[PDB]
Design a binder for this molecule. Structure first.
Ligand SMILES: Nc1ncnc2c1ncn2[C@@H]1O[C@H](COP(=O)(O)OP(=O)(O)O)[C@@H](O)[C@H]1O
Ligand SMILES: Nc1ncnc2c1ncn2[C@@H]1O[C@H](COP(=O)(O)OP(=O)(O)O)[C@@H](O)[C@H]1O
Ligand code: VO4
Ligand code: VO4
Ligand SMILES: [Mg+2]
Ligand SMILES: [Mg+2]
Ligand SMILES: [Mg+2]
Ligand SMILES: [Mg+2]
Ligand SMILES: [Mg+2]
Ligand SMILES: [Mg+2]
Ligand SMILES: [Mg+2]
Ligand SMILES: [Mg+2]
Ligand SMILES: [Mg+2]
Ligand SMILES: [Mg+2]
Ligand SMILES: [Mg+2]
Ligand SMILES: [Mg+2]
Ligand SMILES: [Mg+2]
Ligand SMILES: [Zn+2]
Lengths: 230, 553, 48
RNA sequence: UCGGUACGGUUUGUGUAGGAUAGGUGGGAGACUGUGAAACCUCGACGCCAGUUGGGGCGGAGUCGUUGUUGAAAUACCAC
RNA sequence: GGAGCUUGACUGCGAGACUUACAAGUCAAGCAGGGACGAAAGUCGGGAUUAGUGAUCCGGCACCCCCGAGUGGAAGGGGUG
């Protein structure tokens, strides 16, 4: 307890499941009492991640963005390096960046590379292993024309990936947004998770869902009603 | 109610020797089951079904989906590579080739077509974050510090018997199968590798089976005893002091029930030999009940046991074995340094020390199979030497248990007498047509009994026991130690069993090396109980750890 | 003591032949080269 | 009363440098108004892998973040 | 009696006989497949020969994919060992 966490706990009921809009309504009335916040959604799936064909992994583009720094490290040499900084990449990867990441400077947020210079990716993934900032072909970060996904990672392509205990974790943007802006990222997330739903999922696929702030408690939302996120 | 392994009406039998018959039990995860029973009961034949190495005759036995099975065999094999290469063939075996391809695709893809190999490295680099397999250089270096493995750069052909078992446990404790199948894990392990494995199997996810004859390891790693009598399986709970109660009770209520049946045969055999009187008939419905009682009285006739019997040798002189300033080693590492002792006449001497410290090399300088560095070994004119060995090198697998003791000969020499060979091996329990089993099908508890038949027929008055208390159960462990106390010569024993040197010892030769010497020994005059009180008064009063986790998960 | 073993093929696993062996003189599974009519040629045959 | 299941609170994890080693994942630059170095309390949960995770006595004077690195990984706080 | 290599202790058949109330029992030249030994000729469908065994029914398992109670499947049935 903190004698202010119980103020927001006195305003949100625990047992009552809510609509996707009332979660975004109480996203404003719980987070914004404190400082700035990012809205957190935790989803417990109905899969078992021990098997191979139940590893739920995918990405989604968000329409209203997410409001973050997005320090994208695009890896390309030659004239392809200038295409990233013209597109909006602050630090463009090269060979000199390899000798300073291995020195202990890893201040970046993603890795969008080119298929010709992937030899340096396996050497730079020494310390990018447990960090999980590998270049992924399934999220479009490994592609030939790298002049597309630079502003897309800025645009809100947050990667969701199921853990060992079958718990998705995903952000739908900052807490300084509106109710019609938050619930559409909520609607675009779940509608693309169900496309990634494996065919061998026993039982109810979407068991329990919650929405939480950065300091306050979690909002129990109803997994049953998924049609009217607007 | 989710399970691991289920048996349904399993019946495995090697003909007359049944192992299972109409058995059914289920294994749930988190269970800590220790399986007990006498020697030859069938304990390793159960685990060779539960690992998928053998098939039951008429039954159903299947693992649940997922949760694979790793077995420790009773004689664990290895490969002809190094130690660091001996731990990657399992535990890292399914996952190092996914790293052997990722360091290939870093260079082979850069000159070939970069469009279809994009997902070929895609579905493998995403197999290196769920397991965190980037640290495969330094996960092996943690799993060797836990078991105190040998250094990982030398071969594995010349290792101790308890050093080969440490590198075989690392092949299974890195895999982490949810159904462990440990077959006699505390063989050849010192008092540290057992105390380590008690703590590691305490907090362990998954099901653990362990066929352990010893009384104190099963009280720490098990809480649910499974038993194998003649065919049946008796699951219950307790801590192994209740197993010897119930097997003593299951034979006292079966023994006198089979004595009431014997009196009813004598009352009925007198009726079938009494003759039919005048025109009455001897009823066929009592003849047909006699010949069913007479058939159910011969099937209960399996109650016998053979004692361990050492032949006596010639008269032993005043000088048995003298060792004066012995130095012994193989490399820059020195094992034995400046040792001076002399074996007594008519006593039992115990050799005590951890694994890989120089105990089998101490015998192999005495038997004349090594050569000392400095100092000499001196025997004497009277001593005939008899030597059992740890490796069981004399017994070959593709030759029957009879014609290894003999060589197709009828009568053998057991020291100035001629006993018949089949009469000699039947004095070692191998009776009837069990004398034609080869050495590959014998159990581990009766290769520790066959090795005593090969080497005690030398009839010597100096026997060198290199771990005889290895795979023996409680009935014949007491039969061995009662044959050493009545032995007239001198017996030297290497053993790790603390409650076996405490019972039969007169002299202790124990390793006491520390950080500045690492190669010194110590001759003590007394039993094992007085050695442990002197060990805590000379070096390190009340001083003669935390569990190394083997992994970061 | 002399059970009836059956000899399954090594390619197709068909059970083409049946015969007897001694269990105690031959504890392992017998291996013979026998004609397999499905394959049309001599294959190897362990037991089951 | 003794159990099962569903729901929610409190609490648990310590090879090796270290804040006895957040257990996992995700969010995160703030979180409370600060003395297990406290007054009634004061490890008499566990107490061993020993001191941080309670006996919740009170006080708006008095702990801790991010940085530093010292690591497979960190540090508050919190939903998961 | 001894030694070398081996699996014919074969799959598809069978002109003609013995014996015989019937049911069964027994012998078989030779033809093709794919093999073993042999330089070849050739021999090989267990053992010098005659005992070491049990009709039908009902079932079991393996394989072949023949029938599939409106249709597509399946359950069951059928063949061959
Ligand atoms: N392959 C085999 N063929 C014939 N008999 C066997 C075979 N394997 C084991 N046996 C016999 O069955 C018994 C079962 O061995 P088992 O008790 O499983 O070994 P352990 O004592 O290690 O459990 C042995 O005593 C052996 O005589
Ligand atoms: N032939 C050999 N060459 C080199 N080193 C050996 C050889 N045989 C044994 N060693 C080493 O000697 C050490 C001690 O073995 P030792 O303790 O005598 O075996 P045991 O534990 O059976 O008594 C072992 O660590 C082993 O590495
Ligand atoms: O490795 V040993 O148990 O023969 O000392
Ligand atoms: O599992 V054993 O009875 O051969 O020691
Ligand atoms: Mg065994
Ligand atoms: Mg030894
Ligand atoms: Mg033979
Ligand atoms: Mg036949
Ligand atoms: Mg005909
Ligand atoms: Mg031909
Ligand atoms: Mg030829
Ligand atoms: Mg012919
Ligand atoms: Mg005959
Ligand atoms: Mg009938
Ligand atoms: Mg139909
Ligand atoms: Mg069918
Ligand atoms: Mg036919
Ligand atoms: Zn075939």
């Amino acid at each position: 307890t903190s004698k202010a966490y119980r103020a927001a706990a006195a305003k949100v009921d625990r047992t009552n499941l809510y609509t996707p809009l009332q979660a975004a309504k109480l996203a404003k009335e719980t987070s914004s009492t404190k400082q700035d916040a990012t809205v957190e959604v935790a989803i417990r799936l109905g899969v078992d991640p021990r098997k191979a064909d139940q590893m739920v992994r995918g990405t989604v583009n968000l329409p209203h963005g997410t409001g973050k720094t997005a320090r994208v490290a695009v890896f390309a040499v030659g004239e392809k390096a200038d295409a990233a900084v013209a597109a909006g990449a602050d630090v463009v990867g090269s060979d000199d960046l390899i000798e300073r990441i291995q020195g202990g400077w890893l201040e970046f947020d993603a890795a969008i590379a080119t298929p010709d210079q992937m030899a340096k990716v396996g050497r730079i993934a020494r310390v990018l292993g447990p960090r999980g900032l590998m270049p992924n072909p399934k999220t479009g970060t490994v592609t030939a024309d790298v002049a597309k996904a630079v502003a897309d990672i800025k645009g809100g392509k947050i990667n969701f990936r199921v853990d060992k205990q079958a718990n998705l974790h995903f952000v739908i943007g900052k807490a300084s947004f509106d109710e019609k802006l938050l619930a559409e990222n909520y609607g675009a997330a779940i509608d693309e998770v169900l496309r990634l739903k494996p065919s061998s999922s026993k039982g109810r696929y979407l068991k329990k869902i919650t929405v939480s702030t950065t300091t306050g408690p979690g909002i129990p939302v109803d997994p049953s009603i998924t049609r009217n996120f607007a | 109610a989710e399970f691991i392994y289920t048996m349904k009406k399993v019946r495995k039998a090697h003909g007359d020797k049944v192992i299972l018959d109409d058995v059914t039990l289920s294994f749930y995860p988190g269970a800590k089951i220790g399986v007990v029973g006498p020697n030859g009961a069938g304990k390793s034949s159960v685990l060779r079904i539960m690992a998928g190495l053998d098939k039951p005759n008429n039954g159903d036995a299947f693992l649940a989906t997922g949760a694979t099975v790793g077995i420790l065999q009773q004689e664990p094999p290895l490969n002809e590579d190094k130690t660091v290469r001996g731990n990657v063939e399992e535990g890292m075996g399914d996952i190092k080739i996914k790293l052997d391809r990722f360091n290939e695709v870093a260079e082979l893809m850069a000159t070939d077509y970069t469009d279809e190999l994009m997902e070929e490295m895609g579905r493998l680099q995403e197999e290196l974050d769920h397991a965190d397999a980037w640290d495969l250089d330094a996960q092996l270096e943690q799993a060797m510090d836990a078991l105190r493995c040998p250094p990982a750069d030398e071969p594995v052909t010349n290792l101790s018997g308890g050093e080969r078992r440490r590198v075989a446990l690392c092949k299974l404790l890195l895999s982490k199968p949810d159904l462990l199948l440990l077959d006699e894990p505390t063989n050849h392990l010192d008092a540290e590798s057992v105390q380590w494995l008690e703590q590691h199997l305490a907090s362990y996810p998954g099901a653990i089976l362990a066929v352990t004859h010893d009384r104190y390891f099963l009280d720490n790693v098990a809480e649910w005893i499974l038993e194998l009598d003649r065919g049946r399986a008796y699951p219950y709970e307790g801590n192994y002091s209740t197993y010897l109660e119930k097997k003593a009770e299951r034979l006292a209520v079966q023994g006198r029930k089979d004595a009431k049946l014997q009196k009813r045969l004598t009352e009925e055999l007198a009726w079938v030999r009494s003759g039919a009187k005048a025109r009455q008939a001897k009823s066929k419905a009592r003849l047909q009940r006699y010949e069913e009682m007479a058939a159910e009285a011969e099937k209960t006739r399996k109650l016998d046991f053979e004692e361990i019997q050492i032949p006596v040798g010639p008269r032993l002189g005043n000088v048995v074995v003298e060792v004066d300033h012995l130095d012994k080693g193989y490399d820059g590492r020195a094992l034995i340094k400046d040792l001076s002792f002399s074996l007594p006449r008519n006593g039992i001497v115990g050799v005590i020390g951890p694994n890989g410290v120089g105990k089998t090399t101490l015998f192999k300088t005495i038997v004349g199979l090594e050569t000392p560095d400095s100092g000499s070994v001196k025997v004497g004119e009277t001593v005939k030497l008899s030597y059992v060995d740890q490796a069981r090198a004399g017994i070959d697998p593709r030759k029957t248990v009879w014609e290894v003791v003999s060589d197709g000969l009828d009568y053998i020499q057991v020291g100035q007498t001629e006993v018949p060979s089949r009469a000699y091996v039947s004095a070692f329990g191998f009776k009837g047509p069990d004398q034609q089993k080869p050495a590959g099908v014998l159990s581990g508890g009766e290769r520790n009994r066959l090795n005593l038949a090969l080497t005690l027929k030398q009839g010597g008055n100096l026997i060198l026991l290199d771990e005889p208390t290895n795979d023996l159960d409680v009935e014949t462990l007491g039969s061995l130690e009662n044959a050493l106390l009545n032995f007239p010569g001198c017996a030297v024993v290497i053993s790790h069993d603390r409650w076996f040197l405490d019972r039969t010892c007169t002299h202790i030769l124990a390793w006491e090396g520390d950080d500045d010497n690492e190669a010194k020994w110590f001759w003590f005059e007394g039993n094992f109980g007085a050695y442990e009180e002197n060990k805590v008064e000379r070096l390190g009063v009340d001083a003669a750890v935390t569990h190394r986790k083997l992994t970061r998960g | 003591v002399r059970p009836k073993i059956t000899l399954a093929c090594e390619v197709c696993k068909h059970r083409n032949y049946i015969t007897k062996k001694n269990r105690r003189n031959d504890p392992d599974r017998l291996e013979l080269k026998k004609f397999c009519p499905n394959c049309g040629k001599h294959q190897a045959h362990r037991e089951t």
